[PDB]
Design a protein around this ligand. Structure first.
Ligand SMILES: OC[C@H]1O[C@@H]2O[C@H]3[C@H](O)[C@@H](O)[C@@H](O[C@H]4[C@H](O)[C@@H](O)[C@@H](O[C@H]5[C@H](O)[C@@H](O)[C@@H](O[C@H]6[C@H](O)[C@@H](O)[C@@H](O[C@H]7[C@H](O)[C@@H](O)[C@@H](O[C@H]1[C@H](O)[C@H]2O)O[C@@H]7CO)O[C@@H]6CO)O[C@@H]5CO)O[C@@H]4CO)O[C@@H]3CO
Ligand SMILES: [Ca+2]
Length: 585
């Protein structure tokens, strides 16, 4: 075995607790370079003579270059020292520890997880463990009160083609009037983009964090929204824009006024005075040369307590969580304290970050509860929409990501297809409903949290910013109701099948020629196998499935009963068909 390819660290996503007495260890090694992985361990302060405990490390999944092993160490002492035993293809042996490799156990040293403080066991909202979030871009969702419409509001039709400054008049009263719809769909939470006062139509250049934007409503209307949704079993989440502020934010206006005497010059990153005009700014902004969005200095104690107060004010209205916009550009101290503050007010308040790269550092259990799974989106786009990769590359991608973070965080990533920052998925599919559906079928059955972008469930389509921000389609005979009834049924199942919301994932078949992929979700004795024939040509496959985990399954989407004929399963899928096989348990 190529030792230079065996990885593990007594922390991060390879060593962490799932309980005050249970530690999850994971090891990494070159694909097919290691056949068995066992973990010999015991209490740290144990005598050199006592007998070590054993723990078999099942192969959890396989990257495109690695194999991932995973074991669960029972640690009543809440302290532990462990060493890996790695067996080769033919039979070779080797011990893996902190000191290094050695055919001799003792000479390999031993990894140590110093102590398991219950306060550090990565914990997350239970409701968040089985949710189906629906993303709402308020300005375009529904105009329930045309009296607050901005000036210039354009028509509300299927053929609108928005500009970077267009307005259509969607407001919070519309969202309220639409809860019957949202509740019929089955969503269990709504994620709004910025709803706070701002001159723009997207509202990321916040003018006042303490007031809903006039065009959308007023606090009374909001509270009504929160109450109306709650009794409907729908939680609500807001976009926290703490990285930068709109150049209307009182504090910034002051610096623009009082110049050098402003009591807030250190609330921003001013290079020189006086502040500036057009995109030739002289104060640090989000991205590059964006005047309307000066950068907040969350490192400054004053700014921190301000935004924290801002956070206290909205959690007082009963929201259920936050979506941290541009999260990675604001310090960790901030986020840790933010988590403590939030978690104290409401233990079930969800904190989801928005980072477009390895989030490992914000997913240890002391900051975010999760993030947007852009990866899943990249994998799904290229497997179902643009056909740029195949069933096997897909399997690889799903697995590689799936191993990035501690399970707790993994279990909750927001699996989105598209956002208000991208072309709609249907468009990505060149308008191929068949393909689109298969992707949704995967989304509603894969590991994580499904995130539905308003419109998709109905068949909307469009380019990227701002064509993806068209107004919702409400005229029923202008909506894809067959697709809607599809989402409904998946979501129904997802809520009904435990394994889909609380089980794990395991590859079950990857045929790059047939371009058919299949996985299995498991929890307790329940097994739900999803088969995706992602190809435009009926096909038949035989999948391995030992008589132990059941030998008879039932397709949840058709009610067809399938039987295992000696460990094998013969399935025939119509073009692009998918099957939700349930073992009944
Ligand atoms: O006026 C600015 C912008 O404001 C609002 O954007 C939001 C956005 O909706 C949020 O989701 C979020 O997204 C951030 C990410 O959090 C951040 O990490 C980073 O991520 C990368 C982007 O994903 C990537 O595309 C690129 O950004 C480029 C972009 O590709 C360019 O096309 C260009 O974007 C311009 C837009 O085309 C234009 O519509 C407008 O955007 C509004 C937006 O409508 C509104 O929702 O202006 C921008 C120019 O600023 O430039 C950007 C950056 O140069 O690279 C980044 C990281 O390298 O960026 C995205 C946003 O791009 O937060 C933003 C702002 O709060
Ligand atoms: Ca309106």
């Amino acid at each position: 075995m190529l030792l230079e390819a065996i990885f593990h660290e007594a922390k991060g996503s390879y060593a962490y607790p799932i309980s005050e007495t249970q530690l999850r260890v994971r090891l990494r090694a070159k694909k097919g370079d290691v056949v068995r992985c066992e973990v010999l361990y015991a209490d740290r302060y144990a005598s050199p003579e006592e007998e070590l405990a054993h723990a078999l490390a099942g192969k959890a999944g396989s990257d495109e270059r690695f194999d991932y092993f995973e074991a669960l160490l029972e640690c009543s002492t809440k302290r532990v020292k462990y060493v890996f035993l790695l067996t080769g293809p033919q039979g070779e042996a080797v011990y893996f520890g902190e000191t290094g490799f050695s055919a001799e156990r003792s000479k390999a040293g031993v990894f140590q997880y110093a102590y398991i403080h219950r306060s550090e066991v990565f914990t997350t909202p239970e409701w968040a463990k089985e949710a189906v979030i629906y993303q709402i871009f308020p300005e375009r969702f529904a105009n329930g009160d045309p009296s607050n419409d901005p000036p210039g509001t354009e028509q509300w039709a299927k053929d609108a083609r928005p500009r970077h400054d267009s307005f259509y008049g969607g407001d919070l009263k519309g969202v309220i009037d639409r809860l019957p719809y949202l509740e019929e769909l089955g969503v269990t939470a709504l994620y709004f983009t910025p709803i706070f006062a701002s001159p723009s139509h997207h509202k990321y250049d916040t003018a006042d964090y303490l007031a809903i934007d006039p065009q959308f409503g007023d606090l009374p209307t909001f509270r009504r929204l929160v109450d109306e949704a709650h009794r409907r079993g729908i939680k609500i989440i807001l976009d926290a824009v703490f990285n930068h502020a709109g150049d209307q934010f009182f504090a910034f206006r002051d610096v623009l006024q009082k110049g050098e005497q402003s009591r807030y010059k250190d609330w921003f990153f001013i290079e020189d005075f006086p502040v500036s005009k057009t995109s030739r700014t002289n104060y640090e902004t989000f991205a590059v040369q964006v005047p309307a969005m000066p950068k907040l200095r969350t490192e400054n104690p004053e700014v921190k307590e301000y935004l924290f107060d801002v956070a206290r004010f909205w959690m007082e209205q009963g929201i259920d969580g936050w979506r941290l916009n541009v999260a990675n550009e604001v310090d960790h101290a901030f986020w840790r304290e933010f988590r403590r503050l939030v978690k104290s007010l409401n233990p079930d308040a969800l904190i989801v970050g928005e980072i477009w790269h390895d989030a490992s550092g914000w997913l240890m259990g002391d900051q975010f509860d999760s993030v947007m799974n852009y990866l899943f989106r990249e994998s799904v786009i290229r497997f179902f929409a643009t056909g740029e990769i195949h069933a096997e590359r897909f399997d690889a991608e799903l697995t590689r990501a799936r191993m990035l973070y501690p399970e707790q965080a993994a279990q909750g990533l927001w699996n989105l297809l598209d956002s208000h920052n991208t072309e709609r998925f249907l468009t990505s599919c060149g308008g191929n409903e068949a393909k689109f559906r298969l992707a949704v079928l995967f989304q509603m059955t894969y590991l994580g949290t499904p995130l539905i972008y308003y419109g998709d469930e109905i068949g909307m389509a469009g380019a990227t910013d701002p064509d993806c921000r068209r107004p919702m389609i409400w005229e029923e005979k202008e909506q894809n109701r067959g697709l809607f009834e599809f989402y409904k049924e998946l979501i129904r199942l997802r809520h009904r099948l435990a394994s889909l919301t609380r089980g794990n994932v395991r590859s079950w078949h990857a045929d790059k020629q047939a371009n058919l992929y299949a996985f299995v979700r498991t929890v307790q004795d329940q097994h739900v196998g999803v088969v995706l024939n992602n190809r435009g040509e009926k096909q038949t496959v035989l999948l391995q499935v030992p008589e132990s985990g059941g030998k008879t399954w039932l397709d949840c989407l058709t009610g067809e009963e399938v039987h295992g004929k000696q460990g094998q399963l013969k399935l025939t899928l119509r073009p692009y068909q998918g099957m939700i096989l349930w073992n009944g348990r």
